[PDB]
Design a protein around this nucleic acid. Structure first.
Lengths: 62, 100, 84, 208, 99
RNA sequence: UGGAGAGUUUGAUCCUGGCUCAGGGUGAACGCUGGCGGCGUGCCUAAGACAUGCAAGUCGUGCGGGCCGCGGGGUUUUACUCCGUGGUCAGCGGCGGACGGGUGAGUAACGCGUGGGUGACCUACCCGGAAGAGGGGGACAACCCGGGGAAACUCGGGCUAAUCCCCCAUGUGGACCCGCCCCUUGGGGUGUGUCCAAAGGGCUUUGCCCGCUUCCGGAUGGGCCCGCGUCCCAUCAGCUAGUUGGUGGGGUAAUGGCCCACCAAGGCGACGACGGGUAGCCGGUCUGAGAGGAUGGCCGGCCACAGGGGCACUGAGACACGGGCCCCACUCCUACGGGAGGCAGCAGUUAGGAAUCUUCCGCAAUGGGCGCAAGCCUGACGGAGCGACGCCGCUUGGAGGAAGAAGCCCUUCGGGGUGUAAACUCCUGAACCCGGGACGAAACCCCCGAGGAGGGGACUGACGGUACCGGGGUAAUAGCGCCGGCCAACUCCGUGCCAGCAGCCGCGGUAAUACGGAGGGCGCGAGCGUUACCCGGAUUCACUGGGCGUAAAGGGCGUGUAGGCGGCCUGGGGCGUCCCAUGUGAAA
């Protein structure tokens, strides 16, 4: 199980709710990760990948 | 309704009952071509009147015994040696095969 | 035994009681031995009423007991008639 | 989400003026004539060859721009049109144009789209005794488009009714501004609504 | 917890009693019958036919035995008895049997 | 009335051909955003386990008391009892529990869908016809005396009533025996011999209301059986001894090895047996132009089960979820002697999982049951709630308004672009304030016509002051992916094969339109993205619709079984073809 990408945490539990998809490496890659599941709420700051990369809909002060 | 069908007499052997090889036929539900289908049924006879071959017209009846469904009615023909010979060849070829 | 009963249909708040002949077993929506009419208790459209006295008389004569709103149905649609 | 806001921004999107935004978007520019280039940043930066499928879908877009509707209900409308036996294309066009609010628009009570809806979906309109809102109510060959009774002695009411006295609206619409009525007469057509629309390409995007 | 479904099975126990009693009574009645007929008797055997047949009416009457089954047992009974009387004899007084 | 392909093998071509997505879809799920309403849908896994409240009763027009009632008779009066007699627990009794509820566990199966035989059946509360309602004697509750036990409730005992129960009957008649006539699977009559019937209750009582008796046809569902269809493996080939048959019994509502007795050797098979794996079936449901392929939840019929079983009992019917008996398994009450239990019913609890709700309300509609009804229950149903979980309708404004403001991105400093977008004026008035306001409801019931036709009285609304009407009335939520080619939409720093994106070629190694950030723009919008699972594309298991000389592929080549399809002419038969009439195929 891979990850959704940037922002590395997840000490040992996090619950990589498997999602599913291979890439041209790590023989299989199948069954990805979500973030925000029971841990790992995306990567700090985001704009579009906020459909899996946590960081809700971050609004400023203006 | 009380359907009826044909059949070539197979085997007296049993007491007071004979087996009969019936005929049926039908097309294919996607492939066309009509195909043949034989069928053995319980042809009933209180007085052994139908011998080796005797084609008859057979009948639905009250369950008189064990798988002994059906009966008969009237006779059709005799001298049915060759057809039922190829049947005996069906059993023959049945013993022409084994997986040991 | 066989009876002569009503059966609600439609959707939410738009019922309409279908006149079917059914033995006391077959539950409401369940099934019908035969439908022979319709009574709409709320009134909406000139569809809100119809009975067939022919089959009604059939079931009645050979043995079938109607209900009470059905007693209304006979009270009005005069299926309880006999003329003379 | 039915879009809204800067509308005749999409007038110059296709560069083909789409009245839609009332008197300003009618007389000296449909936010168009002034700068009639497809907006953004590029615009005046040379385009491409729009792949035939794409611009077929673009006359489809164009179609729904000419209504001011969401693509969902509009989609379902297309299904309903293409299905029931008829000349699917013309059927589709005139059908979409049979939508209540637009009736009340081309009729004259409205100047365009958003206003049409606003005051139609307002309940400020009455058909055959009953006052109704829903714009997406596609009327039938034989109805009466009247307008409410406290919607007689009112303002912009008198505006749209002012500018209309002495104009000609579609044949299948009967205009009686002596008694605030509008007969939804015959079925219109492709030649009743002759306008920047090619129903063909539209249909075949839809008819994938 | 509590419900008059105990009512149901109380009465049901009673019905069990009914059944078994009348039933076995009928069984042994029929049996003294087949004995007497087997040896070859007549008079009192066909008297057993009498009382037993009446009994099988009370059977085709209440919810112990019943119609088709009652006439099944009765038929088998009175038929059976005819077979063994004639087997080395001839009955003189009928009853459940004609002539 | 119905059909689109795209990238992908090379230095370039064209085929062979798997991959991939563009697409439709769900009982869903997750991430981001979250306004209204109608209508839906809501443990797909543990057929693990369950706290507490409710799930099926009614009947005093079936019959005798306790005890709450009243006139109060008896008692000179008392004690009080008892004559009359509402209420309430029970009893005996009558009827329902076998309808309503549910899940896939079982089930390769006349179980299911389907087309029928029944001369192999059955059927009560219901309709029609018939002959009838004499008489006897008993029994145990309730009650009263006493033992056991914490509780369970068990135990000896003496009484009372009945529509409880049996006994001789009476015979429109049915049953059997054989006799005889029609039939031709146990279908129909007759004769001789025996068989049995009954319940009374209510009152306005001399009539009616609710009901007993024995039989014949029907109205209703079920039984058994039959024809046909109902998956994956051949690395499951032989199988089987109640097994194929018969005579005589038992069995049952009915034939039947279902069983027993006894005897004869058959029955299934390469047309797929036997064996094992998976799944309850369908009307229909999604999808493709169709062919089909897959699918079976709410709904409609059919099945199976009541934590597993085995089993009778009872009844018209069951092997009976809220009936019972024994092993099992697990939980709990206990004074450790004894004993109790079944949410796959309605709510929820815990486990499990990626995820599957409220222990709300009315019998007012309608339906079951019991009662003559009035009526009593009904977690059926009829209604509220929560979740964009599916569908459909929907507001967040209109209109005016700069050669074009601040702010912000590029820039060749010319300008550009954002955006008529807002600001700036007018109008229209979501929700919010008031007052009003239902449909769902007229039969049952009371009354004259006779109780028939009908005619008048009148009751009854949970939802809910909700639906909505009329008045007052504020400019009033907007997010989601993408922006290389598929596939429509690009400039600018970032970073330097590092972080990263990825369905397919893959993209970044100082100058990336693919990653992050931004200006803008594409699609959608109360939704959008993301994975899960089903058909098409896939003419890429092809019947329409291919193949096979080098691409995957002729058995090495002969042989015959069975099998598949068979020259020319004439006539006889009508299974396939065919056509008409027709029956069914319900509804949804």
């Amino acid at each position: 199980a891979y990850i959704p990408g940037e922002g590395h945490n997840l000490q040992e539990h996090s619950v990589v709710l498997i999602r599913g998809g291979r890439v041209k490496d790590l023989p299989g890659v199948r069954y990805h990760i979500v973030r925000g599941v029971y841990d790992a709420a995306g990567v700090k700051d985001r704009k579009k990948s906020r459909s899996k990369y946590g960081t809700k809909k971050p609004k400023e002060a203006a | 309704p009380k359907k009826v069908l044909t059949g070539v007499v197979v085997s007296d052997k049993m007491q007071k009952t004979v087996t009969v090889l019936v005929e049926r036929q039908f097309p294919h539900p996607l492939y066309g071509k009509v195909i043949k289908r034989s069928k053995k049924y319980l042809a009933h006879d209180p007085e052994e009147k139908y011998k080796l071959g005797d084609v008859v017209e057979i009948i639905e009846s009250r369950p008189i015994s064990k798988r002994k469904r059906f009966r008969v009615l009237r006779l059709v023909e005799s001298g049915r040696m060759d057809l039922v010979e190829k049947y005996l060849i069906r059993r023959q070829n049945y013993q022409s095969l084994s997986k040991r | 035994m066989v009876k002569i009963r009503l059966a609600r249909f439609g959707s939410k708040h738009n019922p309409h009681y279908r006149i079917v002949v059914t033995d006391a077993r077959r539950k409401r929506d369940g099934k019908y031995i035969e439908k022979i009419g319709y009574y709409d208790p709320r009134k909406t459209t000139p569809d809100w009423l119809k009975v067939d006295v022919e089959r009604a008389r059939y079931w009645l004569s050979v043995g079938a007991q109607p209900t009470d709103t059905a007693r209304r149905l006979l009270r009005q649609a005069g299926v309880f008639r006999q003329e003379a | 989400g039915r879009y809204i806001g800067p509308v005749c921004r999409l007038c110059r999107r296709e560069g083909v003026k789409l009245y839609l935004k009332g008197e300003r978007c009618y007389s000296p520019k449909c936010a168009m004539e002034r700068r009639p280039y497809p907006p953004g940043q590029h615009g005046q930066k040379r385009a491409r060859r729009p792949s035939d499928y794409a611009v077929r879908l673009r006359e489809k877009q164009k179609l729904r721009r000419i209504y001011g509707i969401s693509e969902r209900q509009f989609r379902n409308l297309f299904e309903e049109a293409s299905k029931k036996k008829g000349v699917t294309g013309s059927v589709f066009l005139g059908l979409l144009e049979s939508r209540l609010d637009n009736v009340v628009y081309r009729l004259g009570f409205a100047v365009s789209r958003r206003q049409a809806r606003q005051l139609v979906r307002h309940g400020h309109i009455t058909v055959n005794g009953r006052r109704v809102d829903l714009p997406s109510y596609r009327v039938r060959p034989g109805d009466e488009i009247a307008v409410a009774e406290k919607s007689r002695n009112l303002e912009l009411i008198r505006q749209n009714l002012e500018a209309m006295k002495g104009r000609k609206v579609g044949p299948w619409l009967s205009l009686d501004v002596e008694g605030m009525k509008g007969k939804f007469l015959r079925l219109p057509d492709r030649e009743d609504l002759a306008l920047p629309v090619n129903e063909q390409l539209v249909i075949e995007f839809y008819s994938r | 917890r509590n419900l008059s479904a105990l009512k149901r099975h109380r009465q049901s126990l009673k019905r069990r009693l009914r059944n078994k009693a009348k039933k076995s009574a009928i069984k042994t009645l029929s049996k003294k019958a087949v004995q007497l007929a087997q040896e070859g008797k007549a008079e009192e055997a066909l008297k057993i036919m009498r009382k037993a047949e009446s009994l099988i009416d009370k059977a085709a009457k209440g919810s112990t035995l019943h119609k088709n089954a009652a006439a099944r047992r009765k038929s088998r009974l009175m038929r059976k008895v005819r077979q063994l009387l004639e087997a080395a004899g001839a009955p003189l007084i009928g009853g459940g049997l004609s002539a």
